[PDB]
Design a protein around this ligand. Structure first.
Ligand SMILES: *[C@@H]1O[C@H](CO)[C@@H](O[C@@H]2O[C@H](CO)[C@@H](O)[C@H](O)[C@H]2NC(C)=O)[C@H](O)[C@H]1NC(C)=O
Ligand SMILES: *[C@@H]1O[C@H](CO)[C@@H](O[C@@H]2O[C@H](CO)[C@@H](O)[C@H](O)[C@H]2NC(C)=O)[C@H](O)[C@H]1NC(C)=O
Ligand SMILES: *[C@@H]1O[C@H](CO)[C@@H](O)[C@H](O)[C@H]1NC(C)=O
Lengths: 49, 56
């Protein structure tokens, strides 16, 4: 079933017992934290075997 | 609990796993803050069941 990603993450936040509004009220910060964390995986994997 | 949907003209709240449209009210919803932060928010009436009760 198609679902918008900012709605999927509110279901996933609600799944860990954090109220849905905590995603939307922080969505830009949360997106930046995720994008930056994925970037650090590339640096880690490229830097060390 | 559940999710907002529209049939193109009307807005309903409904369960995640089985389509059953419900009229949106202050009892099936909760509030946090002003509109301006929330990406993709839209406008509708949210009904209040108390108003006919006080109107009596
Ligand atoms: C979206 O859902 C609403 C409510 O089920 C539909 O509005 C009703 O439509 C029927 C048939 O035209 C009318 O008899 C009712 O009086 C309408 N109710 C209201 C509250 O207006 C609406 O038609 C649906 N939209 C579409 C595009 O199907
Ligand atoms: C939801 O309704 C509000 C008013 O209740 C709309 O706010 C107005 O929007 C126009 C266009 O941006 C502004 O010129 C007005 O000054 C706004 N009024 C107020 C009181 O803020 C709002 O735009 C509507 N939302 C949508 C998505 O249409
Ligand atoms: C969805 O994409 C359109 C452009 O295709 C954009 O105008 C709109 O603001 C976006 N809405 C959300 C909820 O991301």
């Amino acid at each position: 079933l198609q679902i918008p990603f900012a709605m999927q993450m509110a279901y996933r936040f609600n799944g860990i017992g954090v109220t849905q509004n905590v995603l939307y009220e922080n969505q830009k910060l949360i997106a930046n934290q995720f994008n930056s964390a994925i970037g650090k995986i590339q640096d880690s994997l490229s830097s060390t075997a | 609990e559940g999710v907002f949907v529209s049939n193109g003209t009307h807005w309903f709240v409904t369960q995640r796993n089985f389509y059953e449209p419900q009229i949106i009210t202050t009892d099936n919803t909760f509030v946090s803050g002003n509109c301006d932060v929330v990406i993709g928010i839209v406008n509708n009436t949210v009904y209040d069941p108390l108003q006919p009760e006080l109107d009596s």
